[PDB]
């Protein structure tokens, strides 16, 4: 049958507006900026933004719009030999659909802890804390082996952090039930219902941004926030000599745009043909980058206040890892009037952003995997069993990283499984196939037929030159100057855990050469005939 189309021009805007404006902006860009020194992260961030990420965002939206198929089968008319890029995207989003939702579990664990009249991270006289904990207000009053209540609540109550990935500890029942609650919300809000329609247009679209503006106003007026903004903006140029900044910023663009996932292609698949995706895509990419930049201003003003209050330097005041949004932002919540109310509203904001940017990516995965097998998964009894099986398998695989040694597995997934050199591999192969095996001229002619105009010399030369050169250069540079993944600057990962992370990255990567080999083996003839048959669009 006819698949679906957007029953507005605003359903696409609302779908991608909550699609790639999520925790990659308010949670991930903070610690990836903080981990790489603040100012030095913004140069490759904007290089990959205006050279790669917005062109690949437009690229996948058009590959959805032209080939009205999602993720995998969209390459059936875009050189089917590289159909595995679609498969690669699904592996990426599958791994993303595990680890991303674990964040929301932590947010939900912070949401249930926010209903107390006295916040548990606002003071340390609890059971979970060390005796070395002092209040942040008192660290300039006593005589440097001292720790903050927010970091102690994050590490020994939420995470319950163990000695390493070698010691997973016991499964946290609190966090496992929070993770189960968040998948129950997700599974009840994909297509087990119908569609969130009435409430998504105003509360969803504005209240995360309103709470981000409230957090920005709180952060910028905190004492000592100027040093935090100086950390955030002013670069260390020699830090650009390390490949970590380039790989972190490039795959943070590709993560934050959800753009090697088969999801923006899936949301472009529901676009009408003659629909101007270019202007909407650039306004929404501007929204995404501005949300990241403004939320970074907020959180780094808060970190500058924390460094002012504790006396420790800005680069050491919080976690150089995935808990920076769960350390700095709750600390700013305790600096607001009536902190309980802002705690509930802030973690409702994080939950809303994460659930939107999980409904959208799970929709992309489902859309691609049912365009891959139509009439095996119809619109009825089968795409409830399939949704439940996918959500249950993703929840069970997310139980491995929500345990007591679960931050180490989470940092492994976040560095490797869906936001690393796998993203560079898939983005390079997308831009390479469009540019040279399909043609920027042929694809630009396809673009004009429905958008109305030729893409300029920026998009054409970004798909042609800029994005393959940036992806190849950062992929090569992260391997010829390879430093291993470390969690919070002090935990050295073992060889087997780095191998497991490279296994996740390679399971994402190797869907392209495996599909190339499979389709080269299932077509009869000599090699120059098989390749020519498999690069002709169908």
């Amino acid at each position, epitope marked *: 049958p006819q698949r679906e189309k957007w029953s507005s021009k605003i359903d696409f805007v609302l779908s991608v507006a909550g699609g790639f404006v999520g925790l990659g902006n308010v949670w991930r860009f903070p610690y990836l900026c903080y981990k790489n020194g603040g100012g030095a992260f913004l140069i490759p961030y904007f290089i990959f933004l205006f050279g790669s990420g917005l062109p690949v965002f437009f690229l996948e939206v058009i590959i959805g719009q032209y080939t009205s198929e999602g993720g995998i089968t969209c390459w059936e008319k875009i050189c089917p030999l590289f159909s595995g890029i679609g498969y690669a995207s699904i592996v990426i989003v599958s791994l993303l659909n595990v680890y991303y939702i674990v964040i929301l579990a932590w947010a939900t664990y912070y949401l249930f802890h926010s209903f107390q009249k006295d916040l548990p991270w606002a003071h340390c006289n609890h059971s979970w804390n060390t005796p070395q904990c002092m209040e942040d207000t008192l660290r300039r009053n006593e005589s440097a082996n001292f720790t903050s209540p927010v970091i102690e609540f994050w590490e020994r109550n939420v995470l319950s952090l163990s000695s390493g990935i070698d010691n997973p500890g016991s499964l946290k029942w609190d966090l496992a039930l929070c993770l189960l609650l968040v998948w129950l919300v997700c599974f009840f809000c994909i297509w087990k219902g119908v569609r969130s329609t009435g409430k998504v247009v105003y509360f969803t679209a504005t209240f995360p941004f309103a709470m981000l503006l409230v957090l920005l106003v709180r952060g910028l007026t905190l004492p000592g926030a100027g040093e935090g903004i100086k950390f955030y903006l002013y670069p260390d140029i020699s830090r650009l000599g390390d490949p970590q900044v380039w790989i972190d910023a490039g795959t943070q663009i590709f993560f934050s745009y959800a753009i090697c996932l088969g999801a923006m292609t899936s949301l472009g698949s529901y676009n009408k043909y*003659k629909y*101007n995706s270019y202007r909407d895509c650039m306004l929404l990419g501007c929204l995404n980058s501005g949300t990241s930049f403004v939320s970074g201003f907020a959180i780094f003003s808060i970190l500058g206040f924390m460094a002012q209050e504790q006396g420790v330097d800005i680069a050491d005041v919080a976690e150089s890892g995935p808990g920076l949004a769960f350390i700095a932002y709750p600390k700013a919540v305790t600096m607001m009037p009536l902190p309980t109310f802002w705690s509930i509203l802030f973690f409702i904001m994080l939950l809303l952003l994460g659930l939107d940017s999980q409904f959208v990516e799970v929709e992309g995965q489902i859309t691609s995997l049912v365009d891959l097998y139509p009439s095996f998964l119809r619109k009825g009894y089968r795409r409830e069993i399939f949704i439940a099986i996918l959500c249950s398998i993703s929840y069970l695989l997310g139980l491995t990283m929500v345990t007591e040694g679960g931050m180490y597995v989470f940092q492994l997934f976040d560095y490797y499984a869906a936001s690393g050199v796998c993203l560079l591999w898939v983005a390079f192969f997308e831009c390479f196939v469009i540019a040279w095996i399909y043609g920027v*001229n*042929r694809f*630009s*002619e396809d673009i*004009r*037929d429905m958008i*109305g*105009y*030729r893409p300029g010399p920026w998009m054409k030369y970004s798909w042609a030159v800029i994005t393959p050169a940036l992806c190849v250069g950062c992929f090569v540079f992260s391997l010829v100057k390879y430093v291993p993944l470390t969690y919070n600057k002090v935990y050295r990962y073992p060889d087997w855990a780095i191998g497991l992370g490279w296994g996740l990255a390679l399971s994402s990567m190797l869907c392209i050469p495996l599909v190339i080999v499979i389709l080269l083996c299932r077509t009869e003839g000599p090699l120059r005939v098989r390749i020519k048959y498999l690069i002709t669009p169908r």
Partner: antibody
Amino acid sequence: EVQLVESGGGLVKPGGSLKLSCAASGFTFSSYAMSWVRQSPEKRLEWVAEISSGGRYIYYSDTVTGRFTISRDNARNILHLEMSSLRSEDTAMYYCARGEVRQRGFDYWGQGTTLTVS
Amino acid sequence: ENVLTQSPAIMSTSPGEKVTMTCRASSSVGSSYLHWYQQKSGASPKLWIYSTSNLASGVPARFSGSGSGTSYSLTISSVEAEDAATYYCQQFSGYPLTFGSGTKLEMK
């Protein structure tokens, strides 16, 4: 200086055939979609046939949807409109119009060929 | 076809007098795709207004356009002697592309 010069317009019999020729110069012809727009002796403008930049998206109006064929020569920069079974109400002044951006319109027209059917 | 019915062709204005000409569409034109062409007597049409508001190359600022969806309009604040021509509105979105009728701006 974008210049489109049309040629090959004369007198043909009813039910006959003719091949027009929009020779284009002054621009990269492979990157701009083209159209043939005819104008009636009552001086009304009717769009006849659009070809895309590489020639893969070809559109016709409902009058000429089965008897007109528009083609390009991007190597030599000539737009062609091969006609067949020309009826009486196809006598017109044929312009080739450069329309590539759909929001910019036909920003560069050519001269005319006076196709007469008698 | 998306038949564009424009204002009646013969309209006569003294020079320097503000004039409007309207253009209705049977379907809805997206208002970024409707253009206005000026064709003089014995000459080819040329682009005059694109996306129903902008001005082409060499079009004076006295020419303006407005409208949305179905009703669109071209307006001249002051008519000099070089406006004696025919003006065609044209949707250029729906793939059976249609021009409007004549609007012959003659003088007194």
